[PDB]
Amino acid sequence: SVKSEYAEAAAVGQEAVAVFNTMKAAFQNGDKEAVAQYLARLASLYTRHEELLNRILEKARREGNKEAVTLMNEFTATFQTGKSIFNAMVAAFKNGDDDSFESYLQALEKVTAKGETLADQIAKAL
Numbered sequence: 001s002v003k004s005e006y007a008e009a010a011a012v013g014q015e016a017v018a019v020f021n022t023m024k025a026a027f028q029n030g031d032k033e034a035v036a037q038y039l040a041r042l043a044s045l046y047t048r049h050e051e052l053l054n055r056i057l058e059k060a061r062r063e064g065n066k067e068a069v070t071l072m073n074e075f076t077a078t079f080q081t082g083k084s085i086f087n088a089m090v091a092a093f094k095n096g097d098d099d100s101f102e103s104y105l106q107a108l109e110k111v112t113a114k115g116e117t118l119a120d121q122i123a124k125a126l
Ligand SMILES: Nc1nc2ccc(Br)cc2s1
Pocket: 043, 046, 047, 050, 079, 080, 081, 082, 083, 084, 086, 087
């Protein structure tokens, strides 16, 4: 079902939360070799999440589930805010700009925490 597909997508999202927190600890500790690997693991996770979310939105549209489509349009837009912040963070790491890396890291945390009440609302709507 689209609802079980969203639960799968939500788990992939939680996996990225877990890896992100590990990556934050590694960054604070200066373990740049770990950070590089965690960033790659986050890129693949977000890429997958982005796809599951698109398939769910397209399916809700085909089903005519107007409320779920509204929420998923708002959610995917917020997801892209997070994706842009993540990508700038990766660039800051490549550039050795720890000040920018820190800024992007906190911003991605805030963008993410805000989008949580909507994440739950989508589960109920599908
Ligand atoms: N294609 C995408 N890459 C990312 C990276 C981080 C976050 Br948050 C969302 C996305 S969507």
